Amino acid sequence: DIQMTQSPSSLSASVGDRVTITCRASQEISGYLTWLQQKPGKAPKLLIYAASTLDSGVPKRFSGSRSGTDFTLTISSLQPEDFATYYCLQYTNYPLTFGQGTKLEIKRTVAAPSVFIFPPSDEQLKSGTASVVCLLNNFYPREAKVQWKVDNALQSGNSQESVTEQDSKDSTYSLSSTLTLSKADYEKHKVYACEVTHQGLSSPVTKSFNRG
Amino acid sequence: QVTLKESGPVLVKPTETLTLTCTVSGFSLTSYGVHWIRQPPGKALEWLAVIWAGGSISYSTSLMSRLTISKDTSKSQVVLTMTNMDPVDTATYYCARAYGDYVHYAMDYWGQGTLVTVSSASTKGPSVFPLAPGGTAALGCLVKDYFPEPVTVSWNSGALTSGVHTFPAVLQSSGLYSLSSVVTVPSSSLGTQTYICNVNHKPSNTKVDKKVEPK
Ligand SMILES: [K+]
Ligand SMILES: [K+]
Ligand SMILES: [K+]
Ligand SMILES: [K+]
Ligand SMILES: [K+]
Ligand SMILES: [K+]
Ligand SMILES: [K+]
Ligand SMILES: [K+]
Ligand SMILES: [K+]
Ligand SMILES: [K+]
């Protein structure tokens, strides 16, 4: 099988900047090389086929070139909607084979999170469990530290985090941290707090509530 | 409208058979071929097979004995059957169009993709719980203990789209998925505007609408 070696594997670049993604084929593929764009949670979309032919409707800032076995996708002046995973695809022979992908993130200025905390609902507590949710909204970069303190006691092993994909307009992220406790444990304590550390904050931010 | 749409049961037990249908519109299956591609979660695309306009089929060699492809031109459908499914076959499965009868015709339009989960666990619909609320408040819904993926969340049957963040599902150690969906709204709307999270879990035929009230 033909191996397509795609580089780099991740890029982070600013709006207006130029980026280059390359794919080397392990054998001659003539010009039978396609570039695809895959937004998170969506199907791939055709950008370029036959190595350099721009598909109808694709913005002119996308262009493809060849230098033998090396194929290059260039995005000339990046836009916030360009965050995606990009793939090359050869179709000279079977099996068709893909590069392993380039994840492109839009780089932007640091933005501090807005923090929100949510107590468990009475409906959930009637089921025997208590989920406490902390929300970090619209921040950049993704790196953040969320510590749960229950009656000023630090928690470990009982929370899980999830992060969104970048916003197509302002390139920020949101993050949720969910502290799960048994109902018995939740009733034994009063102050529930999430402390958020992020480089966009001059000092940690704590949001808390009192059970009741 | 040129479109391709995958459908079929999304949960397959180990050693049992996957059947996916690709329904096409805006072109004829005796003029265009249809490729099948899959993508394990977080991994790269992998090509599986193609059925050409004239009916010849080509397969990925290592998977060829497990794959069969049928065409129904009147129904505008191609059907992929994959036998002896294993957990490593959990993936989003895609069909995609290419002209004619030979591999050098580039594939152009892709379908939306369908998430196939291979597991011996049974289906379970979601429990939905409210996440109750400067001049901006946050509210949300916790969508907990469902299987398999995916669930879809909307707010106010689609009217509320700005500010909505629906987080990726987290697999819990129990094996059931959980996620939250949050939205930021003006605090001035909390007493007057109605906020309803609409949760649809097609694999279990479960629809839940949960109103979120500011406690
Ligand atoms: K070549
Ligand atoms: K060849
Ligand atoms: K900065
Ligand atoms: K804050
Ligand atoms: K906010
Ligand atoms: K709050
Ligand atoms: K969780
Ligand atoms: K810091
Ligand atoms: K389906
Ligand atoms: K047809």
Residue numbers in the entry:
A (entry chain L): 1 to 212
B (entry chain H): 1 to 82, 82A, 82B, 82C, 83 to 100, 100A, 100B, 100C, ...
Publication excerpt:
Unlike V17, V21 (bearing both S60K and G66R light chain back-mutations) displayed measurable binding to recombinant HLA-DR in BLI experiments. To this end, the crystal structures of the unliganded V14 and V21 Fabs were solved to 2.5 and 1.7 Å resolutions, respectively. The crystal structure of V21 Fab revealed high structural homology to parental 44H10, displaying similar loop conformations in antigen-interfacing areas and minimal root-mean-square deviations (RMSD) between the two structures. Closer inspection of the structures revealed a slight but significant shift in the heavy chain framework region 1 (HFR1) of V14 relative to parental/V21 Fabs that could conceivably impact the directly adjacent HCDR3 loop. This difference was primarily mediated by the HFR3 residue at position 71, where K71 (as found in parental/V21 Fabs) formed a hydrogen bond with the main chain of L29 in the adjacent HFR1 loop. On the other hand, a valine at this same position in V14 was unable to mediate the same HFR1-stabilizing contact with L29, resulting in a distinct shift in the HFR1 loop. This effect was compounded by the HFR3 residue found at position 78, where a small valine residue in parental/V21 Fabs enabled the K71-L29 interaction. Conversely, the opposite mutations in V21 completely abolished the binding of the wild-type antibody to HLA-DR. Conversely, K71V/V78F mutations decreased V21 Fab’s melting temperature by 2.6 °C, indicating decreased thermostability. Conversely, K71V/V78F mutations in V21 increased the V21 heavy chain RMSFs (mainly in the HFR1, HCDR2, and HFR3) throughout the simulations, suggesting increased heavy chain flexibility and lower paratope stability. Nonetheless, the reversion of L-K60 and L-R66 did not fully compensate for the decreased antigen binding affinity observed between parental 44H10 and V17.
